[PDB]
Design a protein around this ligand. Structure first.
Ligand code: MG
Ligand code: MG
Ligand code: MG
Ligand code: MG
Ligand code: MG
Lengths: 125, 196, 233, 212, 195, 204, 226, 222, 196, 195
């Protein structure tokens, strides 16, 4: 065994394109529409609960997730990828910030941490 | 601490006092020293409370995972898991555990695991600081294949004496009965056992 | 220098409006072994003083003989031995305190904590402590060993300062002492259920109560307590 | 502690600091570290405060008995030896003493004996004892001459204690000065180190490392 | 080893270091140079446990020389002293700490100023007009506190240094076999061969 | 031998009306030997001030560490760290060395730039936060400082009155400690002006 | 330190004194010893103050992540299990002695935990240097089926016993009440029986009393434009 | 192993005025974290207008005071009822203390009274008998908390006259008995706040030419 | 060592094992631990053999000289002499002695003098390393005013258990009966008491 | 104290003793005479624990002077050395022994012979042509073993002694501040005031 894939699976093509990122964006394009609007005294994020079956209880599937008491997230694309990112985002808000400064991270810095995780899946082996 | 487990005709009964001391201060006078590691496999704990709780929790985890894969474990198997933890970590543990359980095939069984982490299968076992004072009494009064009522009386009288002489023992006498019929908890208060 | 072998635990006491109360259990421990169950640790001197002793029992028995000898000696060539020239609590204490401090100064202490409780000739309450170091102090409530940590807080709720003494009756004081003895029995691993209690009153004199027991104990709540965290059965 | 005594043309200068400490805690800044044994003899306090006080007062009593019996002033040699012989009897018991017994007689002239609790008795010209002794020695050794005037000798003793008081954490408070003559010692005042330091810094130009 | 002294005057830093190396009973050497040139205008003297002193000094020297080559540039005395402090501060919580106390005498060519840094084995750094390690300060500081001026010439610094050494030779129980004296100024490092 | 009393020194902080004060002595020593009279123990990162007593190598190391961390904080947050946030950072940083601690007694002082509220805090060597309303003390003369502050302090002192109170608290505490003194500095901190004053004191 | 926990009819109450000490010196006179693990799980700490704070925040942090992961409100048994396994691993070196109390979907709970990792269950508990004084009160006045008001009274009385009789305890009583089906109410400085009397004298100095060598403005602002 | 010594806590304070002297002490007696007594007198009238306190290990303290009181009695017997002057008492106490040099009374002793010119006098002793006349001396548990405050408020240390900026010291003006008692009370109130062994009560013995007077004040009991 | 003395209707009986160990080596397997200090005042010795022999010899001397002057000493008097030696020399002694005697006025009396040198008058007493194991048994089985045969059985059964569990005890069970009728020695061998 | 040397030549005994007195950190004196004249033709040098050295030496001196007066006669060096040995042999089993080592240099007027006795604090006596105490022998004995002759003049003895002191000053870590040298011969005891 051992993970023997220690090389990048995303690489530059002759045209300068990073194929796997483009294809990931194509998967996002197929995803259900979600949106966000910023007001003077608040922000709203919204999406459609596209229920896969009427027998499914769509309340048990949360597309909009609390990351911190003052930060929320919504997505478009692959649900399972989102779910694990929410787990990582929640944890990193504690490990790389709250356990250091005794307060929750500002939005931009939590976004920065999530972004870093997504960047690494674009370069790591 | 005064703890014991006694096999009898219908199975096995575990007994214990309820006193936990920090020096001469009684930090808990209503301690439950009879610990469930499986439905019909229990143990009596003596020594470091931290150690015996940690060990018991790990055993309960092991037997839960055992049960999910291989079905109900034997009392011998439970004793083996206790022994493995006690023997391999003997340098860092202060634990004296009596394991008691009921199978339908094997019926009531008692295993004692003293400080070193050795295992000894016995008809009955006594342990804890208070046990020293009742070696004579227990040896003279134990019989094999006693009734439930006789075994309750034997444990009640034994632990009564252990409590009487050992300052580290006291409070209520707790008992857990393990038979085919199920699991029964008993409790006996000072006003009852002190007049025996 | 030695070590205590056979030991007695707490002695507790307090002042009330007309006198003093003192109490101590009847156990003689041998380490964690509850060896001797009929040890009297309150020793009356005359009809006006009770000396309560904790710690080493062999030294207690020695002190008991000193006090017995003190009474004999005081009576010698003393026509008023049972009147004006009877032993006072203050005389008995000062003598013991002298002995205790002398013995610690020779590096050979009497391994005890002592409370002298009594009523003086003029009716004044006497309550003073002395131990193996020769340390002495007085307080409206006094207790040794575990009693100091558990009895005093309870007894101080009744008599918190000097001005509370005249407001405290013998019934309230005895009730407080008896409750404290129960608490000590719950929480001191070297205590026993059996104890003695002595009341020295300026009107009714010395009342010495033997073979008292801790009663009205709460244990029923123990039946609901299971495991040490997650266990339900 | 910092104590010193030195012999010179005009007799003996005795200079001491005033600080007593228990660990890092400054117990006193007003300790009298010169013991006035009698009007003609002085002793310095270092090591154990009680040991020095007690036994040098006792020494004063022995000196008084000597001159009553012999009808003559006791020599510094004899006085110092009474103390050293006494503390030598107690050797091992844990006395702590480092003192200079200072006097000026006809037969001896100005004389200083370093007496010490392990039994040492040394005659000498310059002695320094205490936690700040090394600092005071520096100033003493580089400026000492036999032909110092009483005024300059007094200042040298003062300046040497100041040097120690500045650098040694366990020295300070104030400086006590004495001048021992044949007709007896003369007290030359108590000098607060705080005020003395700034005064000396300005007038002397020393301690440029310190901002004032 | 034993006595290391430093004094920063108007235009130079002077380091004086004893020549004796004693292994218990015998004085094995009386001409030991307890110093290393870290860069053309930076000198470090040292004292502490045997072996560790030279090992540390040469390790520092190698690192500063490496920096000098990589950047084609001489680090300021302040920068060098900070590097040294960190190495000792790192060392004190190691498995086996460097038991080494140092003085760093450097001439800053940018600021045209001499600079003396005193650093003990714990990584305790102070910039001083004059400094020492061990018991050396106990004997010499009262003399330096008295005579020192910030506008002293190199010759006056050497004279004050001689007085300090004389006091050491008088009151110190150990024979440290004199001192090697080195001057650090705008022209670099040189040794005073008669002291 | 005791690492917290090898070098000596003290820090004291106090709150006043719309202001805080933090002060320290200037001594660094090797036990009995005085080594430096210019060893300042108060540092600042933006508008947040940090005093540190104890082992001098750790004092220097922690200053460099918190400069390091507050610089990165500022680059990422795009704003200066606040006293409340920095206090948590100090606590976190000390506790990460729980079983090999820095032998220090840090003291934080500052005014929150948004609320204008005066803030002080103290720590033990391993990170426990003492957030007092009145005053914080630290160092080898902390007992003396407690005695001075407890009697001299009164709430809502004006900046120039607070200066006298904290100065006299430091000075007289230091003069009863062998390992403190050799100069002193007092910072008077207001929302957008900070004044630094070196005090004249005895040099023994 | 004196900390207690008392079970009652529909919940649990914890209380603590507010004195923290360094040897015989009082470091803080109004210390907060009641720590929040989660909104309705609180605990009180005795022993090494940094350890009690750190272990509470760590488990509290992990409890929060666990709550988010499982979409369930945190349980006291989870906090207990995580605390004891952490403390056991460090073999008593983390000097945290805690009384852990709270309400969750399972009900109301009260546990004690020692630095070595040993835990206990009870209706009334006390920890710290003033625990014997507190337990004396608890053993004298505790009964089954206490009301909320009776439990708060008993808990604070037990802390007072520590305040007055234990030199390690003092100042004020902090209380936190956790009732089933309600928000946990944190009552900071519930009792204040130790306010210092007015001093005999004002020690405010005349301005210019202190001798000053130098003054200077400290630049706290960043590098300026232009 | 038997330890012949103990620590009963307590804090005492002696201040010498111009024609008076006060010796104050808290009334709390302790061992470890327990209170033995909230009112156990620690400062004693020893006769001949001398007040005394031996703070630290109370058994040694009581023994010393008892022996000194006895010494006063025998001084009267042996020297025709001559009044024992405060300086003579001080020297006598040195010998009592130094007599046990190698097994000391574990106490810090302070006595107060008037000298033979009627001026206020305070003497301070270490455990083995080294002593000095002092103007101001705190002893015991909270001595380190009290002394710096007294340096500042009695001797006006570090206090200079406004406008001169360090050039002119604040002049050392004499304090009245009412002024001293204020400083004593504030010293103990502050010590009570920050020291766990200080509290319960404060007893002050004031010595004048008229004799010895007592004042008692409540302190916080936590 | 396992020793005991038990008062009964007609007087008192002393009992003892016969094992004397140096570490794990049995230096004497037929030791006589029942020592005569007077005609009808005997003692059981535990602790340092040197110390308890020295003490007993001194007591025997004291009671012999007492008898020559004042006639037969009481058991209380003998216990007092034992106590005086044990208490005053507590720093230099390791002795645990049970004193048993028969008067005609007082009948059977038992006094135990533990390590500290305190005295405790009891209906019966147990001491020695083996006694720890029979506190429970003896407390449950002792009755006042037993017959000679019952008391012999009580001591035989008690010491049997003490010997069974205590490695430092063993050999024969020796007994000395003190009554008005005189002094009777009894001995019981392993083959007898081990099957009880 | 530290270094004490002795050499017996043709017609005299020469004792060399260091001048330093060091109390831990500082050299308190550099002119200390570590010797006592016991009788006109008998000199004793000494070294060991502070206080005890002088106390013992003066005690011996007093006793020999007492004998001299009582009998109007000077004891032989051998007799004096035996008396001294017994005092030290008695002392070693005392409550607190004299920690003092001595050299006794005497000229026997009856036999017309110089005599050197070495006695340590245990009461270990040996008669030697040359001797020392402490570490002094370790540095000097190889030189004395090489150059010593029983027919040496006093001047040759002093020259050999100078070589011994020079070797001590070179290899010994401690600064003993030179030596006071005294000669014992038929005319009595005299001090060499330039060495
Ligand atoms: Mg363990
Ligand atoms: Mg019991
Ligand atoms: Mg100083
Ligand atoms: Mg200072
Ligand atoms: Mg207090």
């Amino acid at each position: 065994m051992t993970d023997r894939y220690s090389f990048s699976l995303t690489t530059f093509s002759p045209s300068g394109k990073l194929g796997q990122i483009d294809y990931a964006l194509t998967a996002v394009k197929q995803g259900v529409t979600s949106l966000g609007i910023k007001a003077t005294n608040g922000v709203v994020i919204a999406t459609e609960k596209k229920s896969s079956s009427p027998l499914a209880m769509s309340e048990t599937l949360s597309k909009v997730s609390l990351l911190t008491p003052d930060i929320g997230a919504v997505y478009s694309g692959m649900g399972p990828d989102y779910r694990v990112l929410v787990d990582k985002s929640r944890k990193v808000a504690h490990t790389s910030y709250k356990r250091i400064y005794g307060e929750y991270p500002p939005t931009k810095l939590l976004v920065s941490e999530v972004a870093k995780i997504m960047q690494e899946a674009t370069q790591s082996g | 601490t005064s703890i014991m487990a006694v096999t009898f005709k219908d199975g096995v009964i575990l007994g214990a006092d309820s006193r936990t001391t920090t020096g001469a201060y009684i930090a808990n006078r209503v301690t439950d020293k009879l610990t469930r590691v499986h439905d019909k496999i229990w143990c009596c704990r003596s020594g470091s409370a931290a150690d015996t709780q940690a060990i018991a929790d790990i055993v309960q985890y092991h037997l839960e995972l055992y049960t999910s894969q291989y079905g109900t474990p034997s009392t011998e198997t439970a004793a083996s898991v206790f022994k493995e933890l006690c023997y391999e970590n003997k340098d860092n543990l202060t634990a004296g555990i009596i394991v008691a359980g009921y199978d339908d095939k094997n019926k009531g069984e008692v295993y004692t695991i003293p400080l070193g982490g050795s295992v000894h299968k016995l008809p009955y076992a006594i342990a804890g600081s208070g046990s020293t004072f009742i070696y004579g009494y227990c040896d003279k009064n134990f019989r094999e294949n006693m009734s439930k009522e006789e075994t309750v009386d034997f444990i009640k009288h034994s632990l009564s004496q252990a409590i009487k002489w050992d300052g580290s023992s006291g409070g209520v006498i707790r008992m857990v009965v393990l038979t085919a019929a199920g699991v029964e908890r008993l409790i006996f208060y000072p006003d009852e056992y002190e007049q025996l | 220098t030695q070590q205590p072998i056979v030991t007695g635990t707490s002695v507790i006491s307090m002042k009330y409006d007309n006198g003093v109360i003192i109490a101590a259990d009847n156990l003689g421990s041998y380490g964690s072994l509850l060896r001797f169950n009929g040890v009297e640790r309150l020793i009356p001197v005359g009809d006006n003083t009770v000396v309560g002793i904790s710690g080493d029992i062999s030294d207690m028995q020695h002190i008991e003989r000193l006090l017995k000898d003190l009474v004999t000696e005081n009576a010698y060539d003393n026509p008023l031995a049972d009147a004006e020239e009877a032993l006072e609590p203050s005389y008995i204490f000062e003598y013991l305190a002298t002995v205790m401090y002398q013995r610690r100064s020779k590096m050979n202490p009497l391994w005890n904590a002592i409370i002298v409780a009594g009523v003086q000739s003029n009716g004044d309450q006497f309550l003073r402590y002395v131990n193996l170091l020769g340390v002495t102090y007085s307080s409206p409530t006094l207790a040794t060993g575990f009693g100091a940590h558990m009895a005093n807080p309870l007894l101080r709720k009744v008599v918190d300062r000097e001005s509370d003494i005249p407001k405290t009756t013998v019934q309230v004081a005895e009730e407080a002492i008896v409750n404290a003895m129960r608490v000590l029995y719950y929480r001191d691993a070297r205590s026993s259920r059996n104890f003695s209690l002595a009341i020295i009153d300026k009107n009714t004199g010395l009342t010495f109560k033997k073979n008292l027991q801790v009663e009205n104990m709460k244990w029923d709540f123990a039946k609901d307590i299971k495991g040490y965290g997650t266990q339900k059965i | 502690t910092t104590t010193l005594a030195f012999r010179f043309q005009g007799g003996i200068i005795v200079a001491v600091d005033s600080r007593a400490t228990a660990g890092n805690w400054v117990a006193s800044q007003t300790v009298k570290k010169v013991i006035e044994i009698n009007p003609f003899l002085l002793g310095t306090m270092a090591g154990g405060a009680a040991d020095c006080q007690f036994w040098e007062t006792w020494l004063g009593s022995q000196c008084r008995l000597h001159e009553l019996r012999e009808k003559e002033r006791i020599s510094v040699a004899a006085a110092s030896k009474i103390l050293s012989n006494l503390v030598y009897q107690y050797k091992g018991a844990g006395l702590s003493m480092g003192t200079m017994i200072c006097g000026y007689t006809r037969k001896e002239g100005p004389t200083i004996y370093y007496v010490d609790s392990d039994g040492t008795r040394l005659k000498g010209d310059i002695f320094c004892v205490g936690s700040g002794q090394t600092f005071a020695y520096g100033v003493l050794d580089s400026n000492y001459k036999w032909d110092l005037s009483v005024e300059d000798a007094l200042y040298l003793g003062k300046r040497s204690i100041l040097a120690a008081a500045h650098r040694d954490a366990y020295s300070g408070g104030s400086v006590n000065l004495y001048h021992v003559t044949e007709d007896g010692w003369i007290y030359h005042g108590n000098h607060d180190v705080g005020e003395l330091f700034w005064k000396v810094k300005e007038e002397e130009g020393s301690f440029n490392n310190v901002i004032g | 080893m034993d006595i290391i002294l430093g004094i920063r005057v108007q235009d130079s830093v002077i380091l004086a270091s004893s020549k004796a190396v004693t292994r218990g009973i015998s004085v094995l050497k009386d001409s030991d140079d307890k110093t290393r040139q870290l860069s053309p205008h930076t000198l470090m003297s040292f004292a502490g446990e045997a072996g560790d002193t030279v090992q540390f000094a040469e390790y520092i020297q190698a690192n500063i020389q490496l920096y000098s080559i990589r950047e084609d540039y001489e680090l300021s005395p302040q920068a060098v002293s900070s590097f040294v402090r960190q190495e000792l501060a790192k060392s004190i919580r190691s498995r086996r700490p460097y038991q080494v106390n140092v003085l760093i005498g450097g001439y800053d060519k940018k600021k045209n100023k001499p600079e003396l840094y005193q650093i003990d084995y714990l990584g305790t750094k102070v910039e001083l007009p004059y400094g020492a390690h061990g018991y050396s300060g106990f004997y010499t500081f009262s003399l330096l506190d008295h005579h020192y001026r910030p506008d002293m010439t190199t010759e006056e610094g050497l004279d004050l240094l001689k007085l300090c050494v004389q006091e050491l030779e008088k009151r110190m129980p150990m024979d440290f076999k004199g001192v090697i004296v080195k001057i650090v100024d705008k022209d670099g490092i040189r040794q005073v061969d008669d002291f | 031998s005791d690492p917290s009393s090898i070098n000596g020194g003290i820090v004291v902080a106090m709150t006043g009306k719309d202001c805080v004060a933090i002060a320290c002595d200037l001594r660094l020593g090797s036990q009995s030997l005085g080594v430096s009279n210019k060893f300042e123990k108060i540092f600042h990162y933006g508008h947040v001030f940090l005093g540190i007593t104890g082992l001098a190598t750790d004092v220097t190391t922690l200053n460099e560490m918190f400069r390091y961390k507050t610089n990165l904080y500022k680059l990422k947050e795009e704003r200066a760290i606040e006293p409340e946030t920095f206090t948590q950072l100090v606590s976190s940083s000390l506790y990460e060395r729980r079983f090999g601690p820095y032998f220090v007694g840090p003291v934080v002082a500052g005014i929150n730039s948004k609320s204008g509220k005066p803030f002080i805090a103290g720590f033990d060597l391993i990170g426990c936060i003492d957030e007092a309303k009145d005053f914080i003390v630290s160092g080898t003369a902390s007992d003396q400082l407690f005695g001075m502050c407890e009697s001299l302090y009164e709430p809502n002192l004006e900046p120039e009155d607070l200066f006298e109170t904290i100065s006299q608290a430091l000075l007289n505490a230091a003069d009863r400690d062998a390992l403190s003194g050799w100069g002193a500095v007092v910072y008077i901190i207001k929302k957008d002006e900070v004044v630094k004053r070196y005090l004249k004191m005895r040099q023994d | 330190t004196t900390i207690v926990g008392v079970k009652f009819n529909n919940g649990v109450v914890i209380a603590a004194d507010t004195r923290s000490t360094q040897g015989p010196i009082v470091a803080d006179k109004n210390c907060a010893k009641l720590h929040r693990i989660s909104p309705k799980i609180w605990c009180a700490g005795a022993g090494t103050a940094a350890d009690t704070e750190a272990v509470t925040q760590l488990i509290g942090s992990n409890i929060e992540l666990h709550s988010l992961y499982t979409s369930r409100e945190p349980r006291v048994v989870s906090a207990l299990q995580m605390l004891k396994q952490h403390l056991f691993k460090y073999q008593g070196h983390i000097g945290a002695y805690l009384i852990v109390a709270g309400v969750d979907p399972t009900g109301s709970h009260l546990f004690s935990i020692h630095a070595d990792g040993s835990t206990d269950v009870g209706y009334y508990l006390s920890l710290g240097s003033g625990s014997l004084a507190a337990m004396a009160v608890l053993e004298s006045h505790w009964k089954q089926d206490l009301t909320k008001e009776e439990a708060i009274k008993l808990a604070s009385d037990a802390i007072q016993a520590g305040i007055w009789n234990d030199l390690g305890s003092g100042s004020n009583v902090d209380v936190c009440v956790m009732e089933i089906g309600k928000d946990a109410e944190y009552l900071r400085n519930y009792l204040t029986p130790n306010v210092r009397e007015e001093k005999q004298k004002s020690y405010k100095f005349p301005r210019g009393t202190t001798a000053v060598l130098k003054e200077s403005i400290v630049n706290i602002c960043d590098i300026q434009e232009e | 192993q038997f330890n012949p010594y103990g620590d009963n806590g307590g804090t005492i304070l002696g201040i010498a005025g111009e024609d008076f002297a006060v010796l104050a002490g808290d009334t709390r007696n302790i061992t470890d974290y327990s209170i033995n007594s909230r009112y156990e007198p620690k400062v004693f009238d020893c006769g001949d207008n001398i007040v005394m306190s031996a703070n630290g290990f109370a058994a040694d303290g009581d023994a010393l005071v008892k022996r000194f009181k006895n010494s006063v009695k025998w001084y009267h017997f042996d020297h025709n009822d001559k009044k024992l002057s405060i300086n003579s008492a001080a020297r006598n106490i040195q010998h009592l203390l130094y007599g046990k040099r190698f097994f000391p009374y574990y106490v810090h002793t302070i006595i107060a009274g008037l000298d033979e010119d009627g001026k206020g006098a305070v003497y301070s002793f270490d455990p083995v008998g080294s002593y000095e006349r002092e103007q101001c001396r705190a002893g015991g548990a909270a001595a380190s908390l009290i002394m710096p405050f007294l340096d500042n408020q009695v001797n006006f240390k570090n206090q200079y006259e406004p406008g001169t900026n360090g050039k002119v010291k604040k002049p050392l003006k004499y304090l009245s008995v009412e002024e001293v008692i204020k400083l004593v009370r504030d010293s103990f109130t502050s010590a009570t706040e920050r020291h766990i062994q200080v509290g319960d009560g404060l007893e002050i013995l004031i010595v004048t030419k008229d004799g010895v007077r007592k004042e008692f004040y409540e302190l916080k009991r936590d």
